[PDB]
Homo-oligomer: 140 residues x 3
Amino acid sequence: MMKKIDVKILDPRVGKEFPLPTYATSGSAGLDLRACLNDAVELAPGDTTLVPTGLAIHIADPSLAAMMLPRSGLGHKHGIVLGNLVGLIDSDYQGQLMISVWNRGQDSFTIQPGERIAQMIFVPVVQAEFNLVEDFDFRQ
Amino acid sequence: MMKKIDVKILDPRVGKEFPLPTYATSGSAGLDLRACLNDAVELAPGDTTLVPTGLAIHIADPSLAAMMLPRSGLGHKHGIVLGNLVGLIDSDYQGQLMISVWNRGQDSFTIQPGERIAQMIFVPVVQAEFNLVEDFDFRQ
Amino acid sequence: MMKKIDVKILDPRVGKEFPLPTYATSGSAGLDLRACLNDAVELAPGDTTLVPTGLAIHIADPSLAAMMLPRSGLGHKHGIVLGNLVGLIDSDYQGQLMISVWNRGQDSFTIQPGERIAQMIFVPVVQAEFNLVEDFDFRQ
Ligand SMILES: O=c1ccn([C@H]2C[C@H](O)[C@@H](COP(=O)(O)NP(=O)(O)OP(=O)(O)O)O2)c(=O)[nH]1
Ligand SMILES: O=c1ccn([C@H]2C[C@H](O)[C@@H](COP(=O)(O)NP(=O)(O)OP(=O)(O)O)O2)c(=O)[nH]1
Ligand SMILES: O=c1ccn([C@H]2C[C@H](O)[C@@H](COP(=O)(O)NP(=O)(O)OP(=O)(O)O)O2)c(=O)[nH]1
Ligand SMILES: [Mg+2]
Ligand SMILES: [Mg+2]
Ligand SMILES: [Mg+2]
């Protein structure tokens, strides 16, 4: 399923020195986000740092949201994941997309400018209206 | 997209002293869940505690599920996330919604009664039936 | 919503000694994945290990993806979660499904052959095409 989404470039390196996010294949679920940084950031074991993307999106349709996730190789092999675990992007959010990078592992890690550091999917979402009722119709 | 969802209030403070979950805007993807507690819970670095919501939902439609996620500010700034990372709520689950709160950071944190401590989205889900086949048609 | 999905068994114990993933009920959102191991793996506090499933899927439809998540009991009570937090499976991925198991807690844990160790949902996904614009129309 395809959707055109408005994007505003906030840093002039985005789309040039720091490529715009892209799907690798026609069958890819997510697209990689790149770190928009002036210099490398050394991230010690256990620490968190806020990484800018240099861009803003406006999903606009309230039936859609985005989720930011770790990349599997970074997470598994290096312990480089998200400090908020999963990032939820609202349809009406127009600010810069930010990435909370958390080193959950035991080795220091260098986050490099332009590096694909996380990924993002767009999923349909449903807004619930609660209907209060008295009765309906936690090894493993 | 909108859906009416049955909710049963299990604690009489929910909808009163502890507001029912609500979307902040018409464009919000998720709604915040509040801690249904009698007193504050001090959560030491590295520990996990089970927080009640005081409510039960019945999604009922097997084409829908919910996912509980950390709130980004709590996760990034305070290390307050979910012990199970992401909570998956089944359409036929009618028990109390529970929140596994994990302090992944280095500072103690007070979980307060009524505090918005996590969030939840409703997403369409597909149930797979596996079709066994011999052949089809893991820095970063 | 239902979808037939092609699966290739890579280990002859899968579907025999190690049951194929199944939904517990007609209302379940996710299905449990079992560890395809020759012997138990002891996973020390803080460590990560790669667990095979002994199977490959081909979702094939680019409007669908899968997400691997921790099981809530394992995550909350034992700290057994995913090293990449959430696993994203692309529609065109035809390799073995692998599970990055991370012990985030304080006690050693034995991963047993055949054990339900994680779960997986199938969700609709949307592929974005970015439309560059000058202007559109981060306690808690
Ligand atoms: O990883 C993230 C998560 C969120 N965000 C942005 C987009 C989202 O729409 C917005 C709010 O997300 P949350 O509701 O998860 N954060 P929080 O509840 O702390 O902030 P707010 O009070 O604005 O709702 O922050 C990011 O840029 N990166
Ligand atoms: O964060 C959560 C996750 C799940 N739940 C509830 C709702 C869900 O439908 C139910 C089962 O979720 P999981 O399958 O993730 N947990 P587990 O596999 O350990 O329990 P079960 O044996 O019941 O499937 O637990 C919560 O209340 N909070
Ligand atoms: O938990 C996971 C996550 C991914 N995978 C597989 C399926 C997925 O389609 C593929 C790629 O996932 P990511 O894009 O999250 N990993 P990474 O970006 O490190 O690898 P690649 O360069 O192949 O995109 O790895 C797993 O088997 N288990
Ligand atoms: Mg990738
Ligand atoms: Mg919020
Ligand atoms: Mg379960």
